[PDB]
Amino acid sequence: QTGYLTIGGQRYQAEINDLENLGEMGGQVWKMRFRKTGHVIAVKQMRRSGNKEENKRILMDLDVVLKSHDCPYIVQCFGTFITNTDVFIAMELMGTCAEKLKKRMQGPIPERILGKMTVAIVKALYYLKEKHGVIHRDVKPSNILLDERGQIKLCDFADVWSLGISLVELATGQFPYKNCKTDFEVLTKVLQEEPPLLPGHMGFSGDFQSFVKDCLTKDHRKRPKYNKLLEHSFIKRYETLEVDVASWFKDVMAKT
Numbered sequence: 001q002t003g004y005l006t007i008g009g010q011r012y013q014a015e016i017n018d019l020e021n022l023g024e025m026g027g028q029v030w031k032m033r034f035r036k037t038g039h040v041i042a043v044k045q046m047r048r049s050g051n052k053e054e055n056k057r058i059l060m061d062l063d064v065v066l067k068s069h070d071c072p073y074i075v076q077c078f079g080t081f082i083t084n085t086d087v088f089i090a091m092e093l094m095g096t097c098a099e100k101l102k103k104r105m106q107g108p109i110p111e112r113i114l115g116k117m118t119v120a121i122v123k124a125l126y127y128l129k130e131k132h133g134v135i136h137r138d139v140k141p142s143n144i145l146l147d148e149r150g151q152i153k154l155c156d157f158a159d160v161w162s163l164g165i166s167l168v169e170l171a172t173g174q175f176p177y178k179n180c181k182t183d184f185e186v187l188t189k190v191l192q193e194e195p196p197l198l199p200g201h202m203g204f205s206g207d208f209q210s211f212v213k214d215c216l217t218k219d220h221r222k223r224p225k226y227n228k229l230l231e232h233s234f235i236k237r238y239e240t241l242e243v244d245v246a247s248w249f250k251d252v253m254a255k256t
């Protein structure tokens with residue numbers, strides 16, 4: 001469907017000129033304001049003259065995003081605008097990603113935040129795999145989006161390993177392979193060295209350390225199925241525990 005903007009159930013007919021460009025957030029992703037209501041959204045622009053490889057990837061991801069309306073852990077699309085020269089994809093405006101939150105924090109991200117993040121990411125990967133046969137496998141702090149409402153969603157679409165590395169980086173503030181100078185050197189350390197587990201002297205719960213250890217299983221045959229990973233006590237704890245991610249997000253973004 002094209003030519004419509006749906007923000008919270010209210011459906012509006014709209015064209016690209018009904019949006020005011022508030023600047024690049026960076027492909028190109030704009031922050032735009034819907035003049036009719038004042039709502040602010042994220043808009044991804046795909047140029048018809050663009051690279052064939054980049055456009056093909058954009059259209060594949062949009063196909064999944066349009067089918068993922070029933071997953072609360074995937075960034076939602078509000079509508080599309082097709083012009084003679086461009087395609088404008090209206091997405092819900094998130095705050096920032098976990099990589100930038102780590103940079104503003106200038107230190108480890110608390111376990112209670114990573115607990116809610118873990119529950120959101122795993123259920124997004126399981127949804128993508130179960131409902132659409134998509135194997136993401138490329139989870140990193142730059143793909144995990146958060147907003148001031150406390151929401152945690154995936155964007156920009158074997159998977160268990162990259163989640164474990166992302167959790168170790170965010171829990172320690174240190175990327176486990178920061179001293180590798182090439183991509184091949186990273187692959188050698190992944191295969192030759194023991195998995196980079198969580199430190200034991202940072203007050204991490206046994207559930208958190210167990211979950212990261214299960215994610216960083218080198219033998220692919222020994223990695224758990226999703227129905228097993230969704231039963232891990234670390235997932236069970238933060239499925240129900242009250243964690244004020246929204247207030248923590250605002251406090252971190254208030255840092256200079």
Ligand SMILES: *CCC(=O)N1CCC[C@@H](n2nc(-c3cn(-c4cc(Br)ccc4O)nn3)c3c(N)ncnc32)C1
Nearest residue numbers: 025026029042061062075091092093094097142155156
């Ligand atoms: C880690 C955070 C960061 O540095 N960036 C770069 C600038 C844009 C930021 N950002 N991206 C989105 C977004 C992207 N997509 C998307 C849609 C399709 Br269809 C295909 C591929 C992608 O990546 N949806 N949403 C952002 C949103 N929605 N809000 C705020 N910032 C966003 C990420």
